[PDB]
Design a protein around this ligand. Structure first.
Ligand SMILES: *[C@@H]1O[C@H](CO)[C@@H](O[C@@H]2O[C@H](CO)[C@@H](O)[C@H](O)[C@H]2NC(C)=O)[C@H](O)[C@H]1NC(C)=O
Ligand SMILES: *[C@@H]1O[C@H](CO)[C@@H](O[C@@H]2O[C@H](CO)[C@@H](O)[C@H](O)[C@H]2NC(C)=O)[C@H](O)[C@H]1NC(C)=O
Ligand SMILES: *[C@@H]1O[C@H](CO)[C@@H](O)[C@H](O)[C@H]1NC(C)=O
Ligand SMILES: *[C@@H]1O[C@H](CO)[C@@H](O)[C@H](O)[C@H]1NC(C)=O
Ligand SMILES: *[C@@H]1O[C@H](CO)[C@@H](O)[C@H](O)[C@H]1NC(C)=O
Ligand SMILES: *[C@@H]1O[C@H](CO)[C@@H](O)[C@H](O)[C@H]1NC(C)=O
Lengths: 148, 595
C-alpha cells in the first residue's frame, strides 16, 4: 500500500494509533503483522509555488475499518441543514489538498510511506525468503541439504 | 449535530486553509524584504489582500456561532480570537475616514522634514538629523531648537487628525461592546472561564500603579543621580530642585536614557566590557556567532535549529547589487519553517541581538505545536521577555569567559559592575515612568476623563509630577506634543513594554533560583542549567492556548506580575545610589520651571 503522507503524521500509520489520517484515510488493525516503511521525498514531491496534487480526507461521518478505501466525494453534512451538493455553512468538502513547498521544514515535507501487509491463509505459501546457497565440496564427510 | 462539533469542524477547516495562505503570504513578505524590486512588492500586496479578504470571510462565517454554548476552553479562545471584527463594525464612510487619517498620520510622521532658519537650502530629516542631534550633541541651544522644531512642525499638523482618531476609536470600541479604546487595548490581558486564573481590566491598571509606586524610590534616586551629573555639564540650565528638561535626556522624546551614559558614567577610568577586539582577532563571523548561540541554547536544554534555518536564512548582507532591510526580525512561516532577517556584523551588540532573535525562533518552534489561532505567546510581552532574558544571560562576563571571548584571567571589579548596572538601569527603567505616564494619558483620553482643551496641559502636568521632566517653553493647545511618537501616531500599544520589562526580570529571577546559583542576580548564568531550561520550556509550550497567569505561575510561581525582581536586580546599584546621594536632594518639585 503506497501513498504520500505528511512528515508530522508518519507515526499515525501504526496499530493502535489515532489522529486524522489513522481515522479517516487509512487505518491499520490492532493485530497487524507487517512492516511500515517511509522515506523523505522532498526532492521529488515538492515544487516551487506549491504542490497541490496530493489530497487527504479531512471530514468523515465515521472512522474507517482496517484495510478499507473511501473514494466518496459527497459533501460532509456537519449540521442539521441538508447540504444540496454545494458547500457552505455546515457543508464542507471531505477531500483537502496538501501544501508541499521546498522551503518546508521537517514535519511538513512529503514522506512517501509504503505498507507491506503479510497475509497467511490455507493456500500454499507462494512468496518466501531468498534461500541462500553454499559452495560444493567433494571427497569429504559433510552434511547436505538440497531441498528437504 | 451539536454546535461544538460544527465549531471544531470550522476550526479544522480554518487551520487547514489559513495555514497555507499565511505561509504563502510570509514567503512573499520574505522575498520582498530580502529582495526589493517592483514585482516582489506587488506579490506581497496581493498576498496581503488575499489574506485579509480570507480573514474577513472566515470572521463573517464564524460570527454565526454562539460563544455561550461552547464548553471547551480551546475552541472558545479560538472563536474569540477569530471573531475580532474590529474594523468592520463601523460604517463604510467612517472606516474609510479612519484609514485615511491613519495613512496621513503615518505619512506625516515618516515624511516629516524641518529646515534650518538660516539655511533654507538644506533641511533636516528625522532619522539622520534629529536623532543625531538629540544623541551626540551637547549644545543646549541646538537641542532646544531641534526639540521645538520637532514639536511644532509635526505636532500642530496632527491636532485635528488625533482629535478625530480618538473619537473614531472610541466609536469603534463602543460598537464592539467596550467602554473605550483603552478598554479595547486592555482586553488583550483579559482571561475568563478559568477558576482562580481570572483577570479583569481594571486589575491591570491597579497592578501597574502598585508596581510603579513600589519602584518609585529607585527611579527617584536614579533621577537625582542623573540630575547631579548633568548639573556639571549645564551649570545654569538645570536646578538641583526642579525637574530635568525635555531636550537634555539623550532622546528625541526622552524615552531611553542610554545616550546619557557618557555623562552619568560612575567610573570613567575603567572601560565597559567590550569583546569586539577579542572577537575580530579570533577570526569570527556571523555563522560562528549563530553556531555559538545554538550551542548555548542546546546547553540550556532547548532543541537545535532546523536545517531550513541554516540553508534558507540570510545571516549576512548580500552586497550592493541586492538591497535588503537591515532590521533584525524573527520570521515565523508557519509550516515548520523559521528564518532570521538580520545584517549580522561582528559586534557584541550584534551577538546579543542574534541571541534575542534565536530566542524568538525558539519560542516560535515551541508554540508551533498548537493550532494557527493559538500559535502565539500568552501575551504581547512574553516573546520580548524570553528574548531579553537570553540576551542578558549571554552578556554576563562568566558566559563571555566560558565561550572564549573574555580572558579567563580577567578579574571582576565592582566599578565595572556598577557601570554595567547603571547602563542597564538607564536602558531599561529609564523608560518605565514615561511608559506609565503615556499609557495613563492615552487611557484617560480614550475613556473621556480629559477634556479636549486640556490634553497637553494634563500631559505636561503628569510628565512633571509622575516623571521628572519639565517642558522648557510653554506649549498651548495647538502644539500636540504627545502625538510626536511613533507608537501613538501609528495605533500601537505602549503598556506592552512595561509588561515585558516586568516579565523579563521575573523570568530571570525564576531561572536563576531554579539553577541553584548564589550571589547577585545580574551575574547569574543559566547556560549549563537543564532544570531552568525545562522549566522555561514548560511555559513556552503553552503559548496562547493557556492564560498568561497560568503560564506565569508555571514559570515563576505567581499568577500576578510583581516588581520585586526588578528591585532585587538593581539592589547593589540601589545601595550605591543611596550612598552617592547623601548631600543631593532626592526627588523633584513641580513648582520649578525653566520659563
Ligand atoms: C477541547 O478539544 C480538544 C480537541 O481539539 C481536547 O484535546 C484532547 O484532549 C485529550 C485529553 O487530554 C487528548 O487525548 C486528545 O488527543 C486531545 N485532542 C487533540 C489534541 O486534538 C481538549 O481536551 C478539549 N478541552 C477540554 C476541556 O476537554
Ligand atoms: C558547560 O559545559 C561545557 C561542557 O562540559 C563546558 O565546556 C568546557 O569547559 C571546560 C572549562 O574551561 C573546558 O576545559 C572544555 O574544553 C569545555 N568543553 C568544550 C567541548 O569545549 C562549559 O565550560 C560549561 N559552562 C558553560 C557556562 O558553558
Ligand atoms: C532579486 O530579484 C531580482 C529581480 O527579480 C533578480 O534578478 C535577482 O536574481 C534576485 N536575487 C536573488 C538573490 O534571488
Ligand atoms: C461583530 O462581532 C460581534 C460579536 O463578536 C457581533 O455581535 C456584531 O454583530 C458583529 N458586527 C457586525 C457588524 O456584524
Ligand atoms: C544538537 O546537535 C548536537 C551536535 O550537532 C547533538 O549532539 C545534539 O544531540 C543535538 N540535539 C538535539 C538533536 O536535540
Ligand atoms: C570596590 O572594592 C574595593 C575593594 O574591596 C573597595 O575599596 C571599594 O570601596 C569598592 N567600591 C564599591 C563601589 O563598592
Amino acid at each position: 500500500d503506497s501513498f504520500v503522507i505528511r512528515g508530522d503524521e508518519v507515526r499515525q500509520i501504526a496499530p493502535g494509533q489515532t489522529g486524522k489520517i489513522a481515522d479517516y484515510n487509512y487505518k491499520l488493525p490492532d493485530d497487524f503483522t507487517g512492516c511500515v516503511i517511509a522515506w523523505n521525498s522532498n526532492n521529488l514531491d515538492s515544487k516551487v509555488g506549491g504542490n497541490y496534487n496530493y489530497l487527504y480526507r479531512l471530514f468523515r461521518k465515521s472512522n474507517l475499518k482496517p484495510f478499507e478505501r473511501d473514494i466518496s466525494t459527497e459533501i460532509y453534512q456537519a449540521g442539521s441543514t441538508p447540504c444540496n451538493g454545494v458547500e457552505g455553512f455546515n457543508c464542507y468538502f471531505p477531500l483537502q489538498s496538501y501544501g508541499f513547498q521546498p522551503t518546508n521544514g521537517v514535519g511538513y515535507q512529503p514522506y512517501r510511506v509504503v505498507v507491506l501487509s503479510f497475509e497467511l491463509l490455507h493456500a500454499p505459501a507462494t512468496v518466501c525468503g531468498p534461500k541462500k546457497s553454499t559452495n560444493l565440496v567433494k571427497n569429504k564427510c559433510v552434511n547436505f541439504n538440497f531441498n528437504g | 449535530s451539536t454546535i461544538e462539533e460544527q465549531a471544531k469542524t470550522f476550526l479544522d477547516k480554518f487551520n487547514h486553509e489559513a495555514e497555507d495562505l499565511f505561509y504563502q503570504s510570509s514567503l512573499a513578505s520574505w522575498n520582498y524584504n530580502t529582495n526589493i524590486t517592483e514585482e516582489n512588492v506587488q506579490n506581497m500586496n496581493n498576498a496581503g489582500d488575499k489574506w485579509s479578504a480570507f480573514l474577513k470571510e472566515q470572521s463573517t462565517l464564524a460570527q454565526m456561532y454562539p460563544l455561550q454554548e461552547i464548553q471547551n476552553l480551546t475552541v472558545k479562545l479560538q472563536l474569540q480570537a477569530l471573531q475580532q471584527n474590529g474594523s468592520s463594525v463601523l460604517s463604510e464612510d467612517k472606516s474609510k475616514r479612519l484609514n485615511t487619517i491613519l495613512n496621513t498620520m503615518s505619512t506625516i510622521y515618516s515624511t516629516g522634514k524641518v529646515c534650518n532658519p538660516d539655511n533654507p537650502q538644506e533641511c533636516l530629516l528625522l532619522e539622520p538629523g534629529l536623532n543625531e542631534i538629540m544623541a551626540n550633541s551637547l549644545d543646549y541651544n541646538e537641542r532646544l531648537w531641534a526639540w521645538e522644531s520637532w514639536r511644532s512642525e509635526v505636532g500642530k499638523q496632527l491636532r485635528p487628525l488625533y482629535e478625530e482618531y480618538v473619537v473614531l476609536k472610541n466609536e469603534m470600541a463602543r460598537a464592539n461592546h467596550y467602554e473605550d479604546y483603552g478598554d479595547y487595548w486592555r482586553g488583550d490581558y483579559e482571561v475568563n472561564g478559568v477558576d482562580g486564573y481570572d483577570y479583569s481590566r481594571g486589575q491591570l491598571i491597579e497592578d501597574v500603579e502598585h508596581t510603579f509606586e513600589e519602584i518609585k524610590p529607585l527611579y527617584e534616586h536614579l533621577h537625582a543621580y542623573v540630575r547631579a551629573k548633568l548639573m556639571n555639564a549645564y551649570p545654569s540650565y538645570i536646578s538641583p530642585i526642579g525637574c530635568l528638561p525635555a531636550h537634555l535626556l539623550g532622546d528625541m522624546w526622552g524615552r531611553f536614557w542610554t545616550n546619557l551614559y557618557s555623562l552619568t558614567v560612575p567610573f570613567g577610568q575603567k572601560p565597559n566590557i567590550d569583546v569586539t577586539d577579542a572577537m575580530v582577532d579570533q577570526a569570527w563571523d556571523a555563522q560562528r556567532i549563530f553556531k555559538e548561540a545554538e550551542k548555548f541554547f542546546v546547553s540550556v536544554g532547548l532543541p537545535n535549529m532546523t536545517q531550513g534555518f541554516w540553508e534558507n536564512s540570510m545571516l549576512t548582507d548580500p552586497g550592493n547589487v541586492q538591497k535588503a532591510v537591515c532590521h533584525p526580525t524573527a520570521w515565523d512561516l508557519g509550516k515548520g519553517d523559521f528564518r532570521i532577517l538580520m545584517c549580522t556584523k561582528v559586534t557584541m551588540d550584534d551577538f546579543l541581538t542574534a541571541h534575542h532573535e534565536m530566542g524568538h525562533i525558539q519560542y516560535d518552534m515551541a508554540y508551533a505545536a498548537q493550532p494557527f489561532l493559538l500559535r502565539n505567546g500568552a501575551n504581547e510581552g512574553f516573546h520580548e521577555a524570553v528574548g531579553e532574558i537570553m540576551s542578558l544571560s549571554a552578556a554576563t562576563p562568566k558566559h563571555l569567559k566560558s565561550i572564549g571571548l573574555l580572558s579567563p584571567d580577567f578579574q571582576e571589579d565592582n566599578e565595572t559592575e556598577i557601570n554595567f548596572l547603571l547602563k542597564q538601569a538607564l536602558t531599561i527603567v529609564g523608560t518605565l515612568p514615561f511608559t506609565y505616564m503615556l499609557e495613563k494619558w492615552r487611557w484617560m483620553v480614550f475613556k473621556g476623563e480629559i477634556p479636549k482643551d486640556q490634553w497637553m496641559k494634563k500631559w505636561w502636568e503628569m510628565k512633571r509630577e509622575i516623571v521628572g521632566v519639565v517642558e522648557p517653553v510653554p506649549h498651548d493647545e495647538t502644539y500636540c506634543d504627545p502625538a510626536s511618537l511613533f507608537h501613538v501616531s501609528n495605533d500601537y500599544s505602549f503598556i506592552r513594554y512595561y509588561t515585558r520589562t516586568l516579565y523579563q526580570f521575573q523570568f530571570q529571577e525564576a531561572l536563576c533560583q531554579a539553577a541553584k546559583h548564589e550571589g547577585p542576580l545580574h551575574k547569574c548564568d543559566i547556560s549549563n542549567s537543564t532544570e531552568a531550561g525545562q522549566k522555561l520550556f514548560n511555559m513556552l509550550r503553552l503559548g496562547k492556548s493557556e492564560p498568561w497567569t497560568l503560564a506565569l505561575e508555571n514559570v515563576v510561581g505567581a499568577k500576578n506580575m510583581n516588581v520585586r525582581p526588578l528591585l532585587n536586580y538593581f539592589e547593589p546599584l540601589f545601595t550605591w545610589l543611596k550612598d552617592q546621594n547623601k548631600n543631593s536632594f532626592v526627588g523633584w518639585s513641580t513648582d520649578w520651571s525653566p520659563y
